[PDB]
Each structure stands twice: as structure tokens, then as C-alpha cells.
């Protein structure tokens, strides 16, 4: 289950990264000063957003752009924490074997 949800989180994260990159460009174009207006760097922004690396070179300036951003943040946070939860359940189970329980 934990391994499945982890893999499910990864494939969902990828989808969100792709869709989020596409939706960002669509939302940002039309607003003067926006830098998130091309797909290649938008995808790079999506990775930055999901990981929270905080380079701060690219960010949305519109309402819907920021809404897309939030979805990517939470998706990244949920995913990277589901993996942590999956790794924990793995270690907990292995500990319950090296003690014979």
C-alpha cells in the first residue's frame, strides 16, 4: 500500500508538473511584467515549486497563476511526504523482524 501510494504520488506529481507548467503560461500571458510565459522554463519553475528549492528566479504574478502554484506546492509537499511516510513504514516493518515480533 505504502509503496503503491508512493508510486501513485510520483505519477500524479509528474502530471501536475506538466499540467501546471502548461496552465501557468496560459494564466501569466496577458499580464505585463510576467516572466512565466514560456513552457520550457515554466516546467523548470514547476520543479522549483514542487521541491521548494527557493531559487526565486521565476514566480507567477496573476491570481490563477498563483492558484496553479499552490496546487503544485501542495502536490509536491504531499508527494515528498508520502515517500517519507512510506520509507518509515518500511523501516518500522523491518525493525519488527530483527526483533522477532
Amino acid at each position: 500500500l505504502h509503496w503503491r501510494a508512493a508510486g501513485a504520488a510520483t505519477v500524479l506529481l509528474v502530471i501536475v508538473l506538466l499540467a501546471g507548467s502548461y496552465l501557468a503560461v496560459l494564466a501569466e500571458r496577458g499580464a505585463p511584467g510576467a516572466q512565466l510565459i514560456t513552457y520550457p522554463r515554466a516546467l523548470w519553475w514547476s520543479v522549483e515549486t514542487a521541491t521548494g528549492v527557493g531559487y526565486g528566479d521565476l514566480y507567477p504574478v496573476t491570481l490563477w497563476g498563483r492558484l496553479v502554484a499552490v496546487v503544485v506546492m501542495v502536490a509536491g509537499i504531499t508527494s515528498f511526504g508520502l515517500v517519507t511516510a512510506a520509507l518509515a513504514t518500511w523501516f518500522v516493518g523491518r525493525e519488527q523482524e530483527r526483533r522477532g515480533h
Partner: antibody
Framework: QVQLQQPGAELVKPGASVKLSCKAS????????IHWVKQRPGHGLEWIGE????????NYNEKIQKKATLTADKSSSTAFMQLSSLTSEDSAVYYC???????????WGAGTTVTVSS | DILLTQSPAILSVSPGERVSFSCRAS??????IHWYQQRTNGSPRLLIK???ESISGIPSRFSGSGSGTDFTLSINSVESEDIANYYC?????????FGSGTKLEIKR
């Protein structure tokens, strides 16, 4: 093969309107944006607006008077530009261009020479 | 909006020499600049994308350099077919904008 096909010329009466077309061919992606550029005789290039056919979303130049309205037909792969209430100031060559969503205009149309007179 | 200044407006060069077109942005745009060529009665044609990247079908004597706010289009050994107008265009911030344009002129 020619990727963007525009009619050679369009004669318009002052006050009337015209709907320019831009039939496309070649590779087609959802990331494709169709742009329109205005060039008056002896002048430079002027970005009018853009549109993404796979959504119908359109953006326009805010620094100029809005004379244009962008639409597209996904089936016939044709982009449309509605110019309304035209004066002599609107007489120019109108280009259409294709952008892969990476910032540059790879291919241009031959351009439509729009003349506004009676 | 990003302002692109192309000075001078006209360049007079002798056949075989190396010419350089200038494009200055009103603010830092990295390398998000693109160069186009337009001959008489012709449509614009992409020469250089992203400041220095080459385009297929374009003669190798065309090159580009620069970053930030200062960009240069260079033609190595100018010949008669290079006589045209040259425009730069940025894609860093919305909306996209063009330079005023620079005309190449050959003194034969």
C-alpha cells in the same frame, strides 16, 4: 511546404471591417501560439496580439488602440483576425506568425496588404 | 514593457568586412533575445534565437553574442544578399517587443 497561408490583399472601406485569415500546415502542437504583427510602409514591426488555438485564449497589445479580435478554428487549422472600424491609420501589411511557446517566431506568413479607402 | 534600442539605424559596410548590429534592452532579459532579417517586400526570417543559438538553413557567417541588456548580431564577411533590415525581439517579459530595426548598407 509553406506553413502559414495568408490572402494577398484586402480592400476595406473607412468605417467598415475585415476578417483576415491564416491557414496553417506542418507540425501542430497544443503549445503553439499564433501571433499577428502590423507593419506600416517604411515602418517597423508591431506586435498586435496572440492566440492559442488549443484553448481559444487571446492576448492583445495594451499600448495601442484595440482594433483586433482574435479567433481560431481547430479543425481547419486556421487563425482569424477581426479588424473593425478601420481608418487610414490601419492601412498596413499584417503578418501572422507561429510560436512554439518558446518565445521566437519560427515561421511567418507572406502577409496581407490591407488598404483602407473608399 | 521591455524597450529594445537598435543603434545606429543604418550601417554602411564594405564588401567582405565584418559588421555588428547592436540591441540594448531597457532592463536585464538574460539571453532571451531573437534576431530577424527582412529584405525588401519580404517577410521576416529568424536568424538567431536566444542570443547565440544557430538556426537550420541560415548561413554560418551569422552569429550572435551578449547577455543581460547588451546584445550583438554579427555578420562575418558581408555580401550583397545580406542587404536588408534587421530586427531584435525579446521574450523575457510579457508582452513580446521588437527593436526599431537596423538597415544594412553596402558600399560597393
Amino acid at each position: 511546404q509553406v506553413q502559414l497561408q495568408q490572402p494577398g490583399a484586402e480592400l476595406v472601406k473607412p468605417g467598415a471591417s475585415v476578417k483576415l485569415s491564416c491557414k496553417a500546415s506542418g507540425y501542430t502542437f497544443t503549445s503553439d501560439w499564433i501571433h499577428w504583427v502590423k507593419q506600416r510602409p517604411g515602418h517597423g514591426l508591431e506586435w498586435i496580439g496572440e492566440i492559442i488555438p488549443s484553448y481559444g485564449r487571446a492576448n492583445y497589445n495594451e499600448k495601442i488602440q484595440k482594433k483586433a479580435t482574435l479567433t481560431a478554428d481547430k479543425s481547419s487549422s486556421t487563425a482569424f483576425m477581426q479588424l473593425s472600424s478601420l481608418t487610414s491609420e490601419d492601412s498596413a501589411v499584417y503578418y501572422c506568425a507561429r510560436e512554439r511557446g518558446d518565445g521566437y517566431f519560427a515561421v511567418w506568413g507572406a502577409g496581407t496588404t490591407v488598404t483602407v479607402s473608399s | 514593457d521591455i524597450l529594445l534600442t537598435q543603434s545606429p539605424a543604418i550601417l554602411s559596410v564594405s564588401p567582405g568586412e565584418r559588421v555588428s548590429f547592436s540591441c540594448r534592452a531597457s532592463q536585464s532579459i538574460g539571453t532571451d533575445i531573437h534576431w530577424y532579417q527582412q529584405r525588401t517586400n519580404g517577410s521576416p526570417r529568424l536568424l538567431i534565437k536566444y542570443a547565440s543559438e544557430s538556426i537550420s538553413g541560415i548561413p554560418s557567417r551569422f552569429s550572435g553574442s551578449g547577455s543581460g541588456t547588451d546584445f550583438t548580431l554579427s555578420i562575418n564577411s558581408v555580401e550583397s544578399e545580406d542587404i536588408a533590415n534587421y530586427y531584435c525581439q525579446q521574450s523575457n517579459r510579457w508582452p513580446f517587443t521588437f527593436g526599431s530595426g537596423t538597415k544594412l548598407e553596402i558600399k560597393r
